[PDB]
């Protein structure tokens, strides 16, 4: 234990050159893929706006081509999942987490086409789903492919290139290099045993896919919110409360997404025909809602800067939250392709501003700005549901760029993780892996 | 398979007792670091107060520069040698070992030794950081509360030891995320799985950061303002800068390592000759902290001045060379105080140097040296201590130029790769290996 450690410490941070070069090629492919994917979803959302223009007069006829456009795109999405790759439904992060525990397979030949063209459909229809799900999962498979194609040997090379792909996947989805890495070394890693995930190799992956993102998406940020005000010390306790509020709510949300998975499993009973048709019904509803009140539907990146600025009224906020909770469940819980990561930012922003507003009039002496509380609460639902705060805090920090709010952001984030734990909640990503693994020991 | 399902639902479950004790550690670490930082200033102040009272006679003032630092260095080295030899140098190697259980945490001894010891070496204006002191002190504080409250377990032992060390780095740099990331990048047993509760480390870092902000608000450690952005066709220049740091990273490691050895001969392990040699270096630092202040001191004062492009190319080369020397002499000679900080001040100076050459080489790129300064700042940390993710974030938290993230990473990584391929090793783990092998000899 002493003489072995001296041999170990001098042989620390030693990653084989072959792994590193292959980590670089992974990133590139992940980025381009995510870029192409993101370019697809926009193009499809575009034709969808192009149809509403063609039929702008007849009120109910426009509402039809809103529904049927999303319906047909959702149905095409759900089908590709059910018929060719059932593992690539929902997020895909739980599947990759399992793949790192070796307790799941990585059917790359299958998922890539299914998740890619599948996501394009569900996201393109304006459903309340993220890109991470698709890009993270696709990212992992891309990394698995190059392991297979170049038949590389070992646990290290297998776990590492699976991880770096997953990270370059999140990075390219959020232009957030650090968030991608931190996600892997906060969740993603076997939290029960020591793994040979080369952290330096994850880096090169994330870099390449970030560069690839920046080549095609330069000069325009995903979230622009400008430099908000600072946060005085005597204000911090209000973020602690906000955290506690997220903390009790965090697991309550997890139960709802979990339960809704089951409650929607009855509606179709595992039947492909009834599933796809139910899928188009939700999809259609989202494309319908993406017109009658666009804040309720869609990914949610549009209403983040609008809420932070304090442009919604208190009434309009409460409504948006309630309607988004519903829409977020119906889409993700119903196992459509696409992560729940992004809508969880959009949800926390809306709650953050709600809390900010009440604080502002309660405490005029504090000279508050709800926007600070919106940014604190943005990655808070990620910190109490997914239970990866350090990833949530940095993800926000990388997208909003208000470092001066670091303390409030941590205080809220931690305040969420603590109460989310003490009210018996579980990491929603790990809770789904456990659900699918236990369902496998039940049918077998 | 069946054990994993029991594992997954029992994930992120940290005992409430650990968490409450994590919070109490942070507070203590912060306060301590705060008081420590207020000490160093106070002592550097009297040192300026002496030069005032003897401002006329030129060689007479140069004497009270030397003898002021000498007496404070000698007081420092002594406290280490006489009472706790383990708390010399940085202290981070010691805490890393403590996490592998291959080192003891003599808190009853180190706290007073490192604290009052540091105050001396730092207070005399020696080229040493505060991290060393604060990180080590931080760990001991966390060990103290484990012992005082007699808490049971490996989790409780490893966790409170770690959160203290993180709260230690945080309070030393006003950098909460850097503290955490340091623990979960180095610090952790990189060869077995540990029960370090990540959530508990947070609470510690929070509390010591609040502690820092109560006593030091409205004034930043490094102010540099919003620098320009970095165009994609420019990124390759940061790759080169990284490779330059990559070849140099391990070469520096050798020198700190070798210099430890070559200075061990000067005193031969003898406390009397050690302390006297210690005051000679200390004295030289307090002497240099007037004839050319950029060569001596922690280095935080010359970072903004370099980034702004206020030095000439000549002045830079000089500052680098001089700081290389002064950095070794202080740290290698086992004085209390980390080498973390001077390695920031080293990288900034090299960063600007590279930036300036680039600027005139490529007028079409519309460069600003300051961007290469900030890329190169945490680059030496990434090639010598080999914790890039902590270096990148530490700079990012102190300079606040997020727009330069990609260059900062590309340089950082470019450093870590070439520092690996030229057979270099994590300077913090290389010293632990040194001390452990000297133990079985």
């Amino acid at each position, epitope marked *: 234990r002493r003489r072995q450690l001296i041999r170990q410490l001098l042989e620390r941070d030693k990653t084989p050159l072959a792994i590193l070069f292959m980590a670089a090629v992974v990133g590139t492919l992940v980025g381009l893929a995510a870029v192409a994917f993101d370019k697809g979803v926009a193009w499809l959302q575009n034709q969808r706006m192009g149809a509403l223009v063609h039929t702008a007069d007849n009120y109910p006829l426009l509402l039809t081509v809103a529904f049927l456009c999303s319906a047909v795109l959702a149905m095409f999405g759900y089908f590709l999942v059910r018929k060719y790759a059932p593992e690539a439904g929902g997020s895909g992060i739980p599947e990759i987490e399992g793949a790192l525990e070796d307790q799941r397979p990585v059917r790359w030949w299958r998922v890539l086409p299914v998740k890619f063209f599948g996501g394009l459909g569900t996201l393109g229809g304006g459903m309340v789903l993220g890109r991470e799900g698709p890009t993270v999962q696709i990212g992992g498979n891309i990394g698995r492919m190059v392991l297979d194609i170049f038949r590389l040997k070992g646990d290290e090379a297998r776990h590492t290139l699976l991880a770096t792909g997953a990270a370059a996947g999140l990075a390219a989805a959020f232009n957030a290099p650090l968030a991608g890495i931190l996600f892997i070394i906060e969740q993603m890693r076997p939290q029960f045993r020591y793994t040979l995930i080369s952290i330096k190799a994850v880096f090169i992956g994330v870099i390449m896919s970030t560069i690839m993102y920046r080549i095609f998406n330069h000069e325009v940020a995903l979230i622009d919110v400008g430099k908000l005000s600072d946060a005085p*010390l*005597n*204000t911090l306790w209000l973020y602690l409360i906000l955290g506690i509020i997220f903390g009790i709510f965090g697991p309550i949300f997890n139960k709802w997404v979990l339960g809704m998975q089951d409650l929607l499993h009855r509606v179709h009973g595992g039947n492909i025909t009834k599933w796809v048709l139910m899928g188009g019904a939700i999809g259609g509803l989202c494309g319908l809602l993406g017109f009658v009140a666009p804040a309720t539907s869609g990914g949610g990146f549009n209403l983040i800067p609008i809420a932070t600025a*304090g442009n919604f009224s208190m009434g309009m906020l409460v409504f948006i939250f309630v309607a988004r909770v519903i829409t977020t469940l119906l889409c993700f819980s119903s196992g459509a392709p696409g992560g729940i990561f992004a809508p969880m930012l959009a949800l926390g922003t809306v709650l953050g501003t709600a809390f900010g507003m009440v604080a502002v009039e309660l405490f005029p*002496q504090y*000279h508050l700005e709800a926007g600070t509380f919106a940014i604190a609460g943005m990655g808070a639902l990620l910190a109490a549901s997914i239970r990866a705060p350090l990833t949530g805090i940095i993800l926000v920090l990388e997208m909003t760029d208000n470092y001066q709010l670091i303390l409030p952001m941590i205080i809220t984030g931690l305040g969420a993780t603590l109460l989310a734990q003490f009210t018996g909640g579980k990491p929603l990503y790990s809770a789904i892996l456990a659900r699918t693994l236990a369902k496998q020991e039940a049918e077998q | 398979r069946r054990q994993l399902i029991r594992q997954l639902l029992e994930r992120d479950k940290t005992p409430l007792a650990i968490l409450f004790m994590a919070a109490v550690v942070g507070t203590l670490v912060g306060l301590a670091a705060v008081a420590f930082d207020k000490g160093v200033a106070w002592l550097q102040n009297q040192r300026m107060g002496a030069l005032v009272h003897t401002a006329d006679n030129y060689p007479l003032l140069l004497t009270v520069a030397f003898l002021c630092s000498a007496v404070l260095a000698m007081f420092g080295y002594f406290l280490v040698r006489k009472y706790a030899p383990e708390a010399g140098g940085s202290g981070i190697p010691e805490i890393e070992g403590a996490l592998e259980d291959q080192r003891p945490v003599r808190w009853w001894r180190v706290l007073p030794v490192k604290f009052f010891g540091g105050l001396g070496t730092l207070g005399g204006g020696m080229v040493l950081g505060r991290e060393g002191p604060t990180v080590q002190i931080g760990g001991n504080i966390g060990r103290m509360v484990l012992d005082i409250f007699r808490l049971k377990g490996d989790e409780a032992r490893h966790t409170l030891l770690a959160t203290g060390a993180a709260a230690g780095l945080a309070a030393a740099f006003n950098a909460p995320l850097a503290g955490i990331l340091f623990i979960i990048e180095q610090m952790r047993p990189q060869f077995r799985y540990t029960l370090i509760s990540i959530k508990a480390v947070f609470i510690g870092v929070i509390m010591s950061t609040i502690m820092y902000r109560i006593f030091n608000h409205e004034v930043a450690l490094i102010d540099v303002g919003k620098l320009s952005d970095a165009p994609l066709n420019t990124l390759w220049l940061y790759l080169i800068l990284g490779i330059i740091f990559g070849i140099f990273g391990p070469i520096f490691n050798k020198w700190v390592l070798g210099m430890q050895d070559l200075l061990h001969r000067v005193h031969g392990g003898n406390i009397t000759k050690w302390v006297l040699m210690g005051g000679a270096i200390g004295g030289l630092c307090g002497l240099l902290g007037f004839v050319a202040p950029a060569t001596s001191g922690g280095g935080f004062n010359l970072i903004p001045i370099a980034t702004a492009g206020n030095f000439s190319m000549g002045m830079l080369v000089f500052i680098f060379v001089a700081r290389v020397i002064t950095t070794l002499l202080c740290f290698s000679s086992g004085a209390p105080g980390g080498i973390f900080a001077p390695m920031l001040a080293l990288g900034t100076v090299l960063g600007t140097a590279f930036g300036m050459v680039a600027v005139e080489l490529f007028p079409q790129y519309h460069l600003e040296a300051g961007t290469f300064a900030i890329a190169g700042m945490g680059a030496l940390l990434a090639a010598s201590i080999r914790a890039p993710l902590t270096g990148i974030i530490l700079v990012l938290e102190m300079t606040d130029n997020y727009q330069l993230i990609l260059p900062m990473i590309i340089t950082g990584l470019g450093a870590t790769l070439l520092a690996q391929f030229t057979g270099g090793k994590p300077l913090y783990s290389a010293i632990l290996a040194r001390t452990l092998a000297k133990q079985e000899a």
Partner: antibody
Amino acid sequence: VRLLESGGGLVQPGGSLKLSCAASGFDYSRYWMSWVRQAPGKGLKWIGEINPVSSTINYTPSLKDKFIISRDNAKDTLYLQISKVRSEDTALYYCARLYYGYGYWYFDVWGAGTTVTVSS
Amino acid sequence: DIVLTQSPAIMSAAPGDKVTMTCSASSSVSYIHWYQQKSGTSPKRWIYDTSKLTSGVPVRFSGSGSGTSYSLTINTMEAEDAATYYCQQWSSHPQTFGGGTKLEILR
């Protein structure tokens, strides 16, 4: 940093006027601005405050339209309209930059002031 | 709103003398601020958050207290200390000032 307010002078009872505080030597945004008036040989009274985005303007317990605070970041200037004036409004008016320490707010820097005289 | 009344309305003291005014609040207040207004000029920020000296104030000044009772003090007065000193709360909205204490050179 300089605060320099004009617009003072003689006004008729039941009149109204528009004082102006023009700022120089700092980013005029980021800062909260405030008016504080001092009745002759008397105490300091708070009139009101306004944030940079002008999305919150607070006045003292004082009836409806009396005071109308506005600012023009583009010109780096702060305004105060006093309406249906009486003799009580006769005072020295300073504008002020707002800041904090722990978060308990203070009136950071002041202009010289303008004297409004209200008499017929 | 919170009322602040200052103790010696007007007072005199010879140079180099312990000078001590009070600022008593109607309700409970935390972290108050002191302002030095000389004759015919801007008020200047003197002491903030119960006790912190402003960037340029000579160290002979000081202040402390809590809850409902706060005070400013001069260990060794000077000539350049004759002015009105105005305390000011903002622990509650709206913010309120004191009536001022006028310090005068005794001779």
